[PDB]
Ligand binder design. Structure first.
Ligand SMILES: NC(=O)c1ccc[n+]([C@@H]2O[C@H](COP(=O)([O-])OP(=O)(O)OC[C@H]3O[C@@H](n4cnc5c(N)ncnc54)[C@H](OP(=O)(O)O)[C@@H]3O)[C@@H](O)[C@H]2O)c1
Ligand SMILES: O=C(O)CN1C(=O)c2cccc3cccc(c23)C1=O
Ligand SMILES: O=C(O)CN1C(=O)c2cccc3cccc(c23)C1=O
Length: 314
């Protein structure tokens, strides 16, 4: 139920995602998830709903349904705050909204720095994203300070390719290794090489969009759908489980942390019931064979950023 991180802490293998969870619904969603047994919530300042996630955590802490030490709360530094001097302030904003005094894990959300400002996606006159001249290593140094200051227990990365990971690992005077690399992973984007790399380095991998993000912004024509894949539905039927339950279990048996999103009480409940069954190695190998290198999150607007992560094979 929990994986051991390189800082000695233990991360729940199941977490609740909150991207696209509306402010008006996410408080009840998180209260329900905690009641059901979730102990890990995935957040980000860019999701514009951390205050409302925080209301729910505060209510369950007050009710004594959980202790603070039993929860594992994750957030992420957005791209407009990569400058050394903006990092602490961005973390503290998130702490204020979540109404906590430390985060369990704080991730660099994307490797690409953008120009600082109010816009999450700063554009120039020709409509292009304006990049920061910051690099990944100076940002890492700023994240390490947060650990020394007691604001976060662990720090990590998200959407980093193996060369960008290696860059941090070979950083002169590296004080804290990345604990976690959070990446997109599901049967259409299986990530076998990047997962084996990170895992050989003792970095825990968290799979996001495990159900294929059916509620993502654009349903772009003849779009692949994991929940509706007849081959995956067969494997669920054989196990008497739903295709969502098979999609959540799959990464767990690869020793990945998985963070399905839902604001629906019965689905939040359904997605928890994945600890009592096992997919065979045959099932696993079959699910791995469906890889089509399909990404939900390709960050196409940043394809010419100096630190765009997806030009490299893995
Ligand atoms: N680091 C990054 O760059 C990054 C990027 C993307 C995502 N993430 C994290 O990963 C989380 C999960 O990814 P995601 O939100 O893209 O999508 P996801 O979990 O793959 O899919 C969420 C969608 O599936 C529906 N759903 C949930 N359980 C279901 C079930 N049992 N049966 C049928 N449908 C089900 C949800 O609907 P309802 O909500 O209506 O129930 C929602 O529409 C995010 O919320 C976020 O926390 C991180
Ligand atoms: O281009 C794509 O494939 C999809 N995509 C976007 O279109 C995008 C636009 C706006 C904000 C973002 C923040 C995180 C991730 C993405 C974006 C992303 O992957
Ligand atoms: O970055 C994240 O964590 C979440 N995220 C995506 O992964 C994403 C992928 C596809 C299209 C998008 C359009 C707007 C915003 C986002 C996206 C966004 O915030």
């Amino acid at each position: 139920s929990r994986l051991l991180l390189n800082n000695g802490a233990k991360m729940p293998i199941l977490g609740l995602g909150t991207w696209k969870s509306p402010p008006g619904q996410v408080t009840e969603a998180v209260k329900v998830a905690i009641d059901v047994g979730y102990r890990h919530i995935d957040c980000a300042h860019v999701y514009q709903n951390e205050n409302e996630v925080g209301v729910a955590i505060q209510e369950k802490l007050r009710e004594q349904v959980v202790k603070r030490e039993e929860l594992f709360i994750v957030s992420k530094l957005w791209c407009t705050y990569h400058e050394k001097g903006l990092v602490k302030g961005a973390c503290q904003k998130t702490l204020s909204d979540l109404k906590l005094d430390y985060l369990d894990l704080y991730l660099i959300h994307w490797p690409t720095g953008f120009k600082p400002g109010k816009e999450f996606f700063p554009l120039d006159e020709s409509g292009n994203v304006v990049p920061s001249d910051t690099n990944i290593l100076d940002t890492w140094a700023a994240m390490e300070e947060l650990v020394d200051e007691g604001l976060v227990k662990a720090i990590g990365i998200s959407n980093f390719n193996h060369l960008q990971v290696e860059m941090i690992l070979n950083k002169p005077g590296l004080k804290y290794k990345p604990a976690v690399n959070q990446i997109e992973c599901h049967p259409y984007l299986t990530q076998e090489k990047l997962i084996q790399y990170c895992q050989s380095k003792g970095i825990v991998v968290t799979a996001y969009s495990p159900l294929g993000s059916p509620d993502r912004p654009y349903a772009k024509p003849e779009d692949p759908s994991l929940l509706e894949d007849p081959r995956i539905k067969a494997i669920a039927a054989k196990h008497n489980k739903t295709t969502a339950q098979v999609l959540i279990r799959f990464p767990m048996q690869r020793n990945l942390v998985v963070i399905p999103k839902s604001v629906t009480p019965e689905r939040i409940a359904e997605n928890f019931k994945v600890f009592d069954f096992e997919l065979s190695s045959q099932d696993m190998t079959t699910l791995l064979s469906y890889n089509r290198n399909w990404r939900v999150a390709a960050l196409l607007s940043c394809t010419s950023h100096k630190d765009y992560p997806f030009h490299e094979e893995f």
